[PDB]
């Protein structure tokens, strides 16, 4: 898989964004994975990649000068994974998602704690992406 590269890059930022004794309120819920696997799955996934690339990661990079390059590295890897599909097979037949909107609104309400929460759940994100592809 080309996900190993993405998972490698994420292992490098995992520790930084991981947070303690929080009542583990999951941001990337089952509904999102359900959306990824449904009729508008392609659109939900493309929107989530866009959201991470344009709204999450650039904010994540500014949390600490020492984590910046590694966040940017993860971003490049995500952009690559994108192109890989975005310009090839049936993995992105599309050019909305209730679940995704819910994620953005929850993220917004969490503000900066939201940046850390979204980054720490990136492994869950890759898993949902994997779940998506393992279904085509």
């Amino acid at each position, epitope marked *: 898989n080309m996900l190993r590269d993405l998972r490698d890059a994420f292992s490098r930022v995992k520790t930084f964004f991981q947070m303690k004794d929080q009542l583990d309120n999951l941001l990337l819920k089952e509904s999102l994975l359900e959306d990824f696997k449904g009729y508008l799955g392609c659109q939900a996934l493309s929107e989530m990649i866009q959201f991470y690339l*344009e*709204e999450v990661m650039p*904010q994540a990079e*500014n949390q600490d000068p020492d984590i910046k390059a590694h966040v940017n590295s993860l971003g490049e890897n995500l952009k690559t994974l994108r192109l890989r599909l975005r310009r090839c097979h049936r993995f992105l037949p599309c050019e909305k998602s209730k679940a995704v909107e819910q994620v953005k609104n929850a993220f917004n*309400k969490l*503000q*900066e*704690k*939201g940046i850390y929460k979204a980054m720490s759940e990136f492994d869950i994100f890759i898993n949902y992406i994997e779940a998506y592809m393992t279904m085509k």
Partner: antibody, heavy 119, light 107 residues
Framework: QVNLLQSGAALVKPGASVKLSCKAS????????IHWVKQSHGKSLEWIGY????????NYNEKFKNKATLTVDKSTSTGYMELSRLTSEDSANYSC????????????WGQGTLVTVSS | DTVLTQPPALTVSPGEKLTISCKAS??????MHWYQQKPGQQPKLLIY???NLASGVPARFSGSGSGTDFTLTIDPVEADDTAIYFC?????????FGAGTKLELKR
């Protein structure tokens, strides 16, 4: 050389809307977010929300979601905030500020625009 | 939403040490910032992320704290420091500000 130039004071009638602007200069416009803040006479500061100029993505304070609409014109490095259904409660000094993405604190402020809602 | 509680008013003399407390209703980790607003002026950032001095701000200003309890310290304070000081948090949405602490200089 960073500068946020706001549009002029506005005397507007109850029930109408008004659109404020914030012209940015001195930096790469798409590298920073534009936030809007409200300060009513009496001085309490309230955050309205932000807009990421690169994408148009917004984050609104729930308290202003039915009152304010943020937009940007990437091509002219200008941010806008439209206030609708004006009441006397909306009379205040509104300011735009520049934020490093992910660092919601404000080193740079526009000069402020005073909105007076009256017949 | 996170409520920030700061004293409404404080009086101190030039040359002395002044501390302003700001308490949040829930943790904001290190994301507490401070502004100085003089009459007729827009707010000016003094301290960011609890203890970092904003560029251009004199070293007489410092801050400390994490979690729910923070303090802005001006040492020594001087006559033109009369103004209103605001604390603001960015850890939780929406961003919120304290009600402001008006600083009076005794003479």
């Amino acid at each position: 050389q960073v500068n946020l130039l706001q549009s002029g004071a506005a005397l507007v009638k109850p029930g109408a809307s008004v659109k404020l602007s914030c012209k940015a200069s001195g930096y790469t416009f798409t590298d920073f977010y534009i936030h809007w803040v409200k300060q009513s006479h009496g001085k309490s500061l309230e955050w309205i929300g932000y807009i990421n100029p690169n994408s148009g993505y917004t984050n609104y304070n729930e308290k202003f979601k039915n009152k304010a609409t943020l937009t940007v014109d990437k091509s002219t490095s200008t941010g806008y905030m439209e206030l609708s259904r004006l009441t006397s409660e909306d009379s205040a000094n509104y300011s735009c500020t520049r934020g490093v993405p992910g660092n919601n604190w404000f080193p740079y402020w526009g000069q402020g625009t005073l909105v007076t809602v009256s017949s | 939403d996170t409520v920030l509680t700061q004293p409404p008013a404080l009086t101190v003399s030039p040359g002395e040490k002044l501390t302003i407390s700001c308490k949040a209703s829930e943790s904001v980790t290190s994301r507490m910032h401070w502004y100085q607003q003089k009459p007729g002026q827009q707010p000016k950032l003094l301290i960011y992320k609890a203890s970092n001095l904003a560029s251009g701000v004199p070293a007489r200003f410092s801050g400390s704290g994490s979690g729910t309890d923070f303090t802005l310290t001006i040492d020594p304070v001087e006559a033109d420091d009369t103004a209103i000081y605001f604390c603001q948090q960015s850890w939780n949405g929406p961003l919120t500000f304290g009600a402001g602490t008006k600083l009076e200089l005794k003479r």
